[PDB]
Amino acid sequence: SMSFVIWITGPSGAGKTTLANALYKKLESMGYRVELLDGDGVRRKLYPNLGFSEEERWMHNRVVVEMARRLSRNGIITIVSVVSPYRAWREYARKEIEKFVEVYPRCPLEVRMKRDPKGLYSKALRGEIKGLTGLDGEYEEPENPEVVVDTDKMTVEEEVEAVLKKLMELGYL
Amino acid sequence: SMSFVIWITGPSGAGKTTLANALYKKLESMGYRVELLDGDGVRRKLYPNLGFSEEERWMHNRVVVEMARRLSRNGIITIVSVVSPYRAWREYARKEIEKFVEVYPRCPLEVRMKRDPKGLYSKALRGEIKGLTGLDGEYEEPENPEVVVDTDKMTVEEEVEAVLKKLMELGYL
Ligand SMILES: Nc1ncnc2c1ncn2[C@@H]1O[C@H](COP(=O)(O)OP(=O)(O)O)[C@@H](O)[C@H]1O
């Protein structure tokens, strides 16, 4: 009766929301109950005035982890899309969630910018993307995630297939 | 399938946790998926250093309500045990939750004080804690809750039967 959480982490513009939406539609089409936690949409609903300091982002991540823990332990496949840039935060998520599937959409900064110049500009202008020494400074890459997909080399359909294959191998479906 | 939320509100020692646990056991024995959401427990887990300004308490109310909204929209009965002292913030919860069951354990101060294993009333009277709802914090009683139980006059099994009777009348099972 315990379900699982697909935790999609990666820098802004890597393709997290695109993959999250496609996974949601795929698993719903196979008949499963699924819930999508869009990190930015959760922020807008719960605390739209919260800033983007390290301590504020950590509190937001802890809220998302707890929502995903409660949903998944009641049998709901939960898909999370959050930057979650520090390994320590994702290791906290992993210890809180019994069946944790860490998915890393890996994509060079040059491609991330080319795919959405206006969106990245707007987020950086608002202080949502930090870059005291540059854009690529902050994110800490997962060392052994369940899935890595290179979104500059794969289609979204291939990314979905890679995640599903791993879910099958884990026995989660 | 949309499920419902049992929102148990009232001052410390009124019997919220006891009723929450008994309803959980009863509804689980009937075959339902149920989740217990203790509002102060969530605050202590997620952000134990969060203050108690009006803005921070409003944030926390929104977090608890959204957890319940997400669980109940995926078919999970959510039983919320939460002091929730303000009528207006329970109206927010009522608007967010499609099938909302507000339950008020009404209990005179004398009896709450005799049902206080954590010693909260004693701590509040000696100034070790402040703003205890039902002592030096005011509690705003519900105007028209779905259920009022006088927990100094009813047994827990009688309270469960009263809640269940109203759930039957509401058609929420
Ligand atoms: N596999 C892919 N191939 C081509 N473009 C992609 C791919 N994945 C995402 N994109 C595009 O990249 C941009 C950023 O994706 P998005 O999912 O919004 O990123 P994030 O949620 O990580 O910020 C969007 O324009 C999206 O359509």
Ligand SMILES: Nc1ncnc2c1ncn2[C@@H]1O[C@H](COP(=O)(O)OP(=O)(O)O)[C@@H](O)[C@H]1O
């Ligand atoms: N109807 C009742 N009759 C007798 N004792 C009760 C009743 N309801 C609750 N209690 C007792 O009151 C005490 C405090 O109850 P609790 O549910 O912890 O209060 P709250 O969660 O509102 O702070 C518990 O020890 C519990 O067993």
Ligand code: NA
């Ligand atoms: Na409602």
